[PDB]
Design a protein around this ligand. Sequence first.
Ligand code: GNP
Ligand code: MG
Ligand code: NH4
Length: 403
Amino acid sequence: GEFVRTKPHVNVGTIGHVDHGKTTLTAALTYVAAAENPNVEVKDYGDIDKAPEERARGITINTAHVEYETAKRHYSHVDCPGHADYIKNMITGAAQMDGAILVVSAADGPMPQTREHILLARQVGVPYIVVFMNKVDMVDDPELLDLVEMEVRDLLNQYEFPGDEVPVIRGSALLALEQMHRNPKTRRGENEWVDKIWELLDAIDEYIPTPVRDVDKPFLMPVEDVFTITGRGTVATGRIERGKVKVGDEVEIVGLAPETRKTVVTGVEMHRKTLQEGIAGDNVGVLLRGVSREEVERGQVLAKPGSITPHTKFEASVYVLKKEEGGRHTGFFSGYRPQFYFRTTDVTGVVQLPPGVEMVMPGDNVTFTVELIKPVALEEGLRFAIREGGRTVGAGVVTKILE
Ligand SMILES: Nc1nc2c(ncn2[C@@H]2O[C@H](COP(=O)(O)OP(=O)(O)NP(=O)(O)O)[C@@H](O)[C@H]2O)c(=O)[nH]1
Ligand SMILES: [Mg+2]
Ligand SMILES: [N+]
């Protein structure tokens, strides 16, 4: 139907190591919220991990977006894969979050992608984290639980999150999900597992603030995914970063292609509900006229025409991870060609070191220039991650644009 704004909107999502329970939690959240609010459609496990390749491999691969709401706010929730081979998709999801739910298995404790997701969430600008300690149903010993919490809090401190301050909710996504299946009308106060989900929801309501958003600046929406709707056309999805978009607006597709191209917006939706106007913070799908799904792609940005100039070469201040932070064992030279991650963009770039800087070692803080093989929407102060051969190697921020 039509989208009615009644509440402040916030984007959250789930991150954390493979199998720790991100998707089960995502599903439990929709079920628990739906019992209090009739506007919430429940999403089952299989509705989220829906792709044939996900069924085949038994993991989340694609980000999924689900909707739910509390009395306080409206939420779009991005569920991210935890598998190490799909970090690229996790980063794109994280780039949409005003807050992340870090799911950590009580039975396993923090694992390498617990660490890596925290680090990367930061480098695409996730400002707040709530922790959900999942699978406590499997853990008898309260001392392990305390140990796990202790480890998570400290790990978050390592990446300059306020680890001692974040809410840590202990529960079981699966047992809440099960209770909601047996009684979908189960309200708060009736069941201890479901009430842990309410504890998570309260914590999200109150600890993750509604972001300050600029609706007056030029329209800008990083593209997350692109698909063809049969009978309607090409839809580009994403979180609107700033400004507003209305059906009928001309927009520019910026980045990744040699030339910027224009199109007209012909539809705007949030969770398959019609938006009169999309605004900063909205998680939308934008129908684009006269372009195929081979002419818009992840990592481009939709922008007010002439508001953004795509760039290829910049200076950056970079920290290179130590091996004990998931980084590489050895260093690199000029000519190193890793992947660079800016918002939803992933682009091969060439490290070019200063005269005199022969080598960069793990644990170094350094400045160098980068040349991307494709132009990308960039600006000074933009944070980015560096990855190569399937591992995270560094974090940086743009200091100056050059070309
Ligand atoms: N005992 C127990 N098992 C749980 C709980 N939540 C999830 N699981 C189990 O843990 C496994 C992984 O759950 P899932 O939600 O797919 O985790 P994920 O983090 O989304 N995986 P991925 O990283 O691939 O996206 C499943 O077998 C699921 O039933 C829980 O609260 N308790
Ligand atoms: Mg999953
Ligand atoms: N998924």
